[PDB]
Amino acid sequence: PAVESRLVGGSSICEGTVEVRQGAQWAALCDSSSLRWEEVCREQQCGSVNSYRVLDAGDPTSRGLFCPHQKLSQCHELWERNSYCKKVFVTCQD
């Protein structure tokens, strides 16, 4: 099963916090380079990434899933980061 991604919480599907899933519940993606965000925008069938900002630094309760490989499309398995997950807000063009 490929990793799927999606932008949650934005005023359209072209913007929002990145969420991912494999055989899964959806969970936030943790990150720490525009390569990955461009794939995420285009998989939504939006335009190219135009900006992103790291969210939730320093919050021990922030959790999600993590992929130790530049691109999502090259992850065979996501790993849990159950605290201090830095999430990502991506904004794509329409």
CATH architecture of the domain with residue range 1-94: Roll (3.10)
How was this structure determined? It was done by X-ray
Domain boundaries, the chain: 1-94
Q: From the CB of residue 75, how many other CB atoms can be counted at a distance below 10 Å?
A: 18
Given a contact cutoff of 8 angstroms between Cβ atoms, the answer to whether 18 and 30 are in contact is: no
Task: Collect contacts of 56-61 with beta carbons under 8 A, ≥24 apart.
Answer: 56/85, 56/86, 56/87, 57/86, 58/84, 59/84, 60/84
Q: Which of 39, 50, 59, 69 is nearest to 10 (CA)?
A: 50
H/E run at residue 35: helix 34-43
Nearest to 3 by CA among 78, 84, 90, 94: 78
3-state helix, strand, coil in the chain (%, to 5): 15, 35, 50
In units of Å, what resolution does this entry have?
2.5
Asked if residues 67 and 29 have their Cβ atoms less than 8 Å apart, the reply is yes
